[PDB]
Amino acid sequence: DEVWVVGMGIVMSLIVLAIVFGNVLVITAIAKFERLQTVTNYFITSLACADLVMGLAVVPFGAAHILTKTWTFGNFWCEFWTSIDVLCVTASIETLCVIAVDRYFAITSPFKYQSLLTKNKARVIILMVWIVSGLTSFLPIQMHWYRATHQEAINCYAEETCCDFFTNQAYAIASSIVSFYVPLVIMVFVYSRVFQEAKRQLQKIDKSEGRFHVEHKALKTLGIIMGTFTLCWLPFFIVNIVHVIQDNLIRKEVYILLNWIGYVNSGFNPLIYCRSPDFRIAFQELLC
């Protein structure tokens, strides 16, 4: 049989449909209803836009390349596609970091939260995030600064029917540091402090109203948030660092598999973040 030819296509199409439907529903729900327009919901809008772009562009052409085993399009479109991939991934991760910092400021400083965050300052931050995303994905790739120098890489670059990722040590390390590790450290610190604050509040409530009946929730929420992200993206950004240092340690198929596992995070974000009752009411009004 040829269960590989037809089997993988079904799964890839399902992934594309799930990503597109979820992100479109979130975006149109925020846009149509005036109640949902909040300074917290603009970051979710940027995240959903990045996920929608990735689902429409990065995934279908990668699936076609995998199934056909050749890059039938031009040589220019290979670099265009790589640039869009890197852009979307880094923009999404930094938007997640921005949301985490927003929550940190909301709980930690209750009185001064209103002054720090304003609709004017919630746009400058998003524009800066997207600009920083664009200055690491288009500028180095299109200027041919990431290109490797060895016989297989040179032969891949010369041929017009081969689109594979070969990169330098410097670009790999700098891209990984910019895209993954700094947001990871920021999120770890932020969520640790938020957990401390929640524990202090529970202690105070128990000490005050203990005689009447009157950390499972905090643990469950933080576990979902930080386990649907580290598990999805961490394994890839270790082999990314390793594969340049050691020539034959990491195979080429494991790289692509871990990369595609990383992409799946786009279709999960509406589930993780758009769970408020207002969002459910808006979804119920739109559909059904």
Q: Point out which residues bind ligand G1I (CB under 6 A).
A: 82, 85-86, 89-90, 165, 175-176, 179, 259
Instruction: Pick between residue 43 and residue 165 the one whose CB is nearest to ligand G1I.
Output: 165
Question: In whole angstroms, how close is the CB of 16 to ligand G1I at the nearest point?
Answer: 17
Question: In whole angstroms, how close is the CB of 172 to ligand G1I at the nearest point?
Answer: 6
- Annotated binding residue 42: no
Instruction: Pick between residue 46 and residue 90 the one whose CB is nearest to ligand G1I.
Output: 90
Query: Of the candidates 236, 266, 92, which has an alpha carbon nearest to the alpha carbon of residue 165?
Result: 236
- Annotated binding residue 240: yes
Query: Of the candidates 286, 239, 288, which has an alpha carbon nearest to the alpha carbon of residue 261?
Result: 239
Instruction: Pick between residue 157 and residue 195 the one whose CB is nearest to ligand G1I.
Output: 157
- Annotated binding residue 90: yes
Question: In whole angstroms, how close is the CB of 57 to ligand G1I at the nearest point?
Answer: 12
- Annotated binding residue 85: yes
Spatial separation of the C-alpha atoms in residues 239 and 82, rounded to whole Å: 18
Question: In whole angstroms, how close is the CB of 260 to ligand G1I at the nearest point?
Answer: 10
Quick count: other Cβ atoms within 10 Å of Cβ 95? Answer: 26
Spatial separation of the C-alpha atoms in residues 10 and 13, rounded to whole Å: 5
Q: Amino acid identity, residue 245?
A: I
- Annotated binding residue 191: no
Instruction: Pick between residue 180 and residue 279 the one whose CB is nearest to ligand G1I.
Output: 180
Q: Amino acid identity, residue 166?
A: F
Q: Amino acid identity, residue 151?
A: Q
For the chain, first and last CA: distance in Å? Answer: 41
- Annotated binding residue 175: yes
Instruction: Pick between residue 142 and residue 221 the one whose CB is nearest to ligand G1I.
Output: 142
DSSP 8-state secondary structure symbol assigned to residue 57: I
CA dist 283 → 23, 48, 273 (Å): 12, 15, 14
Spatial separation of the C-alpha atoms in residues 129 and 94, rounded to whole Å: 7
Question: In whole angstroms, how close is the CB of 227 to ligand G1I at the nearest point?
Answer: 21
Give the annotated binding-site residues for (S)-timolol. Answer: 85, 90, 240, 259, 263
Binding site residue list for (S)-carazolol: 85, 175, 259
Question: Binding site, residues?
Answer: 85, 90, 175, 240, 259, 263
